[PDB]
Write a protein that binds this ligand. Sequence first.
Ligand SMILES: NC(=S)c1ccc(-c2ccccn2)s1
Ligand SMILES: NC(=S)c1ccc(-c2ccccn2)s1
Length: 186
Amino acid sequence: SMLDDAKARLRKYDIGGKYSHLPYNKYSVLLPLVAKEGKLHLLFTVRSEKLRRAPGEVCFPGGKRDPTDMDDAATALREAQEEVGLRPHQVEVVCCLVPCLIDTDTLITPFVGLIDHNFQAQPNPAEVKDVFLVPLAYFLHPQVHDQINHIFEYTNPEDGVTYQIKGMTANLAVLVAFIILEKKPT
Ligand SMILES: NC(=S)c1ccc(-c2ccccn2)s1
Ligand SMILES: NC(=S)c1ccc(-c2ccccn2)s1
């Protein structure tokens, strides 16, 4: 099936816990995959305008590890619950993708999660101003804008609202799209 196929593909790129013990400042992100109308989508947030770090920007749910977290996946799930109400019974963590190094002292670990078909986002307004879905296939033929620097623009056909997706968030989306959709019969 579509979902079994996605997981089998994703597992071949799982790096494991290899890098997770290194002595960095540590953050995790969840890349939430949602099936809708016969196709896979990614779920994104727009961060609240009142946050210190990157207010108003499009990003995946995530944040800083704390001492309660058993491992890096736990950080990602704790943060996804706090930001959009996603509960643990509603997500299957499938793998851990290549982590991102930044500012010489920080390591960000992305986890791909399959989301339950009855989940509905309850955005917490102190952290998240908006929640939206993008079809995974958009990332193979995006609408690119040059700020010189590559920015994606996505317009939701439901309401005509345009979103800008960039940086690490945009890089990870393209990666997940390549992994799951490359080389497929129609
Ligand atoms: N969710 C996003 S984009 C961020 C979360 C945390 C961020 C940060 C923290 C310390 C220094 C610089 N940026 S950015
Ligand atoms: N939830 C997301 S996307 C992030 C959380 C942590 C991020 C970060 C931290 C330090 C410097 C730069 N970016 S990004």
